[PDB]
Design a binder for this molecule. Structure first.
Ligand code: NAG
Ligand code: NAG
Ligand code: NAG
Length: 428
């Protein structure tokens, strides 16, 4: 995709902390909006290359020609997309006039994403999920994205990280408008329940580490392994993911190894009100520790009180950390084998040892209604079915067009981001 300047591109500044054994030091940073939310149009005019959920027939005949004829434009972060930063805080608004949701990446500079090496290090952040009802997701995660957005590998990309290009995940999303310096007009199917999205022929795969998938009702910690650690282009049903005839035909794991305190047995640990150990009406600190083995440790901090991850009994397993033993026990108890099929913890440990881009987003589910996070899932399973109940929300809740009209002023606030070796983020 090319670059147009019908509107200037200014990344909202966000400060984070880099920690070491002797202290934590402030770092200058900024966030960039994903390329899919941007206005794609002709390089020489105001003619849309993509309007609604249908591509331009004259400007985008094929994938390669479209990228030559079309440009990405600057984004009004506050006015159009409702994204504001104030020192430590990054605030994302669910609904803005003519817009829903957002996805942003932390940057080292304007030209490059900020790459994190999780192996041997820990990640800490404060989050406000009080305004996040059922059907929404305040997501904070890491993905194996190219630091430059793929400008080095693909010459068709002239935008780069400066305009939020080159997104990848384990779902291998085919909904991306631009992949590898090429458009996705070929084989593009408009969405039936979304007047702004669609499904193309190609997709984008990379290792995904979901540190935070949460609302006021439930929170989940999920590692996703891919056969290819870095970014690769997928083709058709081969990529897999939620939107394909086959979900487990890709090179990646869509399901993942997930740790949901509610799903594992504890229904009074995370929720709204004094009753829960972690009151979601109030903000909390979430610390995620990554060992060199790939094992994932976790503790929370709310109002000065440290909460260890609650011990869960899954089959023969007993503990509070994500490891091969738990991930195998969860697969046997609840069902599915997708995590270990793509290499498991040993495969995604390669992603921890490599660079991954920090992603902070707010979105609703147009496919499942977020029932996989905060409700009983799937529909074909009963409340009695092991690992079916993941939250306390209704099976009717989460409908995108319902929650957009009901709670348009929903928001998630990410603040106090710290990164450093294990045991360094807490104080000094
Ligand atoms: C931007 O970021 C990368 C990694 O921090 C750095 O190596 C590079 O020098 C920076 N480029 C600039 C500041 O122009
Ligand atoms: C779940 O929540 C908290 C975690 O600290 C704990 O006090 C409580 O005993 C747990 N309940 C269970 C395991 O049933
Ligand atoms: C249950 O639902 C899933 C879709 O999420 C489907 O693939 C599966 O075949 C269904 N049937 C059974 C018997 O579990």
């Amino acid at each position: 995709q090319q670059v147009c300047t019908q509107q200037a591109e200014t990344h909202p500044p966000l400060t984070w902390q880099k920690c070491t054994a002797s202290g934590c030091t402030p770092q200058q940073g900024s966030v960039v909006l994903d390329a899919n939310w941007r206005w794609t149009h002709d390089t020489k005019s105001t003619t849309n290359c993509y309007d609604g959920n249908t591509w331009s027939s004259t400007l985008c005949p094929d994938d390669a020609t479209c990228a030559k004829n079309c440009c990405l434009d600057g984004a009004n972060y506050s006015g159009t997309y409702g994204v504001t930063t104030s020192g430590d805080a990054l605030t994302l608004q669910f609904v803005t006039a003519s817009n829903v949701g957002s996805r942003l990446y932390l940057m080292a500079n304007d030209s490059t994403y900020q790459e994190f090496t999780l192996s041997g290090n820990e990640f800490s952040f404060d989050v406000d999920v009080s305004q996040l009802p059922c059907g929404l997701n305040g997501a904070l995660y890491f993905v194996s994205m190219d630091a430059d957005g793929g400008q080095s590998k693909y010459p068709g990309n002239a935008a780069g990280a400066k305009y939020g290009t080159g997104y990848c995940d384990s779902q291998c999303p085919r909904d991306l408008k631009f992949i590898n310096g090429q458009a996705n007009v070929e084989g593009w199917e408009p969405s039936s329940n979304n007047a702004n999205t669609g499904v193309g022929g190609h997709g984008s795969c990379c290792s995904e580490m979901d540190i935070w998938e949460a609302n006021s009702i439930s929170e989940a910690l999920t590692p996703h392994p891919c056969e290819t650690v870095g970014q690769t282009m997928c083709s058709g049903d081969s990529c897999g993911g939620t939107y394909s005839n086959d979900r487990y035909g890709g090179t990646c794991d869509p399901d993942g190894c997930d740790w949901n305190p509610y799903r594992l047995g504890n229904t009074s640990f995370y929720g709204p009100g004094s009753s829960f150990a972690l009151d979601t009406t109030k903000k909390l600190t979430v610390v995620t520790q990554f060992a060199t083995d790939g094992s994932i440790s976790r503790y929370y901090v709310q109002n000065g009180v440290k909460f260890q991850q609650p011990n869960a009994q899954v089959g023969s397993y007993s503990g509070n950390t994500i490891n091969t033993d738990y991930c195998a026990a969860e697969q046997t108890a609840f069902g599915g084998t997708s995590f270990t099929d793509k290499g498991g913890l040993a495969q995604i440990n390669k992603a921890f040892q490599g660079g991954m881009v920090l992603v902070m987003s707010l979105w609703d589910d147009y496919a499942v209604n977020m029932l996989w996070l905060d409700s009983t899932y799937p529909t074909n399973a009963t409340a009695s079915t092991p690992g079916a109940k993941r939250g306390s929300c209704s099976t009717s809740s989460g409908v995108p067009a319902q929650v957009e009209a009901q709670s348009p002023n929903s928001k998630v606030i990410y603040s106090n981001i710290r990164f450093g070796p294990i045991g360094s983020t807490g104080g000094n």
